[PDB]
């Protein structure tokens with residue numbers, strides 16, 4: 001895991017750098033402040049003490065700025081994770097390529113140390129077949145358009161299937177609607193409609 | 203320049219050329235397949251099919267595109283010319 | 293000048309690591325935007341759309 | 342770059358270098374440098390009366406990694422900056 005390891009390693013190395021900062025003189029003649037107190041008088045060793053104060057203050061200010069920036073990016077990541085929770089897990093999100101690569105169904109959150117993961121369940125097609133399509137069917141001068149599917153042909157006859165699955169069905173009135181005349185679409189094909197009311201009225 | 207004082211500029215990992223190649227491949231995917239290539243394998247589709255599907259996505263029935271497809275194509279071409287002319291004029 | 297820089301080598305290490313992080317995140321920003329697909333789709337020679 | 346031979350073929354790279362060229366360890370075997378391959382160069386057959394309707398699906402699971410918190414630390418000047426001295 002990379003996104004959960006850097007947030008710990010960078011913090012650990014920042015704490016280690018803070019520890020290492022006390023081992024430097026910052027231009028003074030000793031690192032520990034007790035040494036100059038023991039070997040030099042406080043009236044004379046005031047400037048070295050003040051230099052150590054300035055160096056430690058600069059190191060603390062740099063660490064505070066770094067921690068503020070890390071907290072800002074952690075806040076942004078937490079807001080993103082909360083939105084991903086509330087959309088992908090607590091419902092189904094219509095945003096494409098947001099809850100994983102594919103058509104999202106649901107996500108399963110899992111606890112993580114100083115983090116969170118989401119177990120997205122996507123819907124990707126596996127096998128596809130090439131087909132010849134047409135926007136409209138000219139039956140009796142009226143152009144038929146699919147309500148939710150698309151006209152497809154296997155070479156001899158025509159069917160209508162949904163967008164993400166191949167479910168061939170007979171061209172009928174229940175899944176098609178008419179609009180206008182036949183001479184409005186640049187590409188149209190001639191066929192017939194089942195009209196499943198005609199055989200039942202006999 | 204600004205490199206004489208050692209303020210060295212790191213070259214990017216991706217140059218302009220393969221960024222342009224990425225954009226061209228994405229354009230080809232979105233004009234030849236719509237959104238199938240962004241959520242799985244690319245599926246071939248006619249462009250008016252995709253246009254009617256985008257129209258269906260905003261609550262407009264797909265029967266209106268094929269009745270005035272030339273008008274929508276001319277409007278799209280005019281809009282492309284307009285954005286090109288506006289960008290040429292920062 | 294380099295002799296007195298051992299007292300602030302920790303500061304220098306922090307600055308160098310910060311710029312290295314800036315550079316690597318600037319590199320990764322382009323990968324998260326343009327590299328959405330892993331297959332380069334060629335434009336068909338037919339321009340009749 | 343020294344210590345890595347240059348080869349004209351292109352693969353997917355793992356160690357980035359910059360300016361569109363990477364380095365990797367392939368076939369004995371030695372470190373080679375090559376231009377990174379943006380992906381599988383394939384063409385999609387496009388036609389005004391050709392469609393592709395999927396007939397099967399695979400339920401896939403995608404892993405995402407997101408941190409939400411970090412270790413809460415408290416720092417005080419008096420026992421960091423100073424030791425056991427009043428001055």
Ligand SMILES: *[C@@H]1O[C@H](CO)[C@@H](O[C@@H]2O[C@H](CO)[C@@H](O)[C@H](O)[C@H]2NC(C)=O)[C@H](O)[C@H]1NC(C)=O
Nearest residue numbers: 129152153154155156157158159168169170171
């Ligand atoms: C295209 O689809 C049609 C409709 O399903 C197929 O025609 C049927 O094929 C089955 C398979 O032997 C026969 O039992 C039926 O009697 C056929 N019905 C009609 C009305 O012909 C056709 O075979 C399919 N063609 C291809 C190439 O797949």
Ligand SMILES: *[C@@H]1O[C@H](CO)[C@@H](O[C@@H]2O[C@H](CO)[C@@H](O)[C@H](O)[C@H]2NC(C)=O)[C@H](O)[C@H]1NC(C)=O
Nearest residue numbers: 137138139140141142181182183188189190191
């Ligand atoms: C689809 O059907 C229409 C009408 O049934 C056909 O249009 C006819 O075409 C013939 C000769 O091609 C003309 O003599 C008729 O006057 C046309 N009628 C109308 C109403 O336009 C059309 O040709 C058919 N298309 C195909 C490919 O068979």
Ligand SMILES: *[C@@H]1O[C@H](CO)[C@@H](O[C@@H]2O[C@H](CO)[C@@H](O)[C@H](O)[C@H]2NC(C)=O)[C@H](O)[C@H]1NC(C)=O
Nearest residue numbers: 124125126127128165166395396397398399400
């Ligand atoms: C859709 O894909 C799945 C996954 O490969 C197919 O399921 C396999 O079917 C074969 C033969 O029927 C079996 O030997 C495997 O054990 C099945 N695998 C699993 C994981 O169930 C399925 O048959 C495909 N469907 C169609 C219509 O092609």
Ligand SMILES: *[C@@H]1O[C@H](CO)[C@@H](O)[C@H](O)[C@H]1NC(C)=O
Nearest residue numbers: 128129130131385386387393
């Ligand atoms: C369908 O046929 C066309 C050419 O006839 C081909 O380019 C395409 O790859 C085929 N589709 C599939 C899924 O095999």
Ligand SMILES: *[C@@H]1O[C@H](CO)[C@@H](O)[C@H](O)[C@H]1NC(C)=O
Nearest residue numbers: 186187188338340388389390
């Ligand atoms: C598809 O395009 C080809 C080439 O321009 C053309 O010959 C054919 O008539 C077109 N088909 C339709 C249905 O528009």
Ligand SMILES: *[C@@H]1O[C@H](CO)[C@@H](O)[C@H](O)[C@H]1NC(C)=O
Nearest residue numbers: 346347348349350351374375
């Ligand atoms: C790679 O192939 C090209 C093809 O012409 C050739 O010009 C070039 O010299 C080759 N590079 C190497 C390193 O062999």
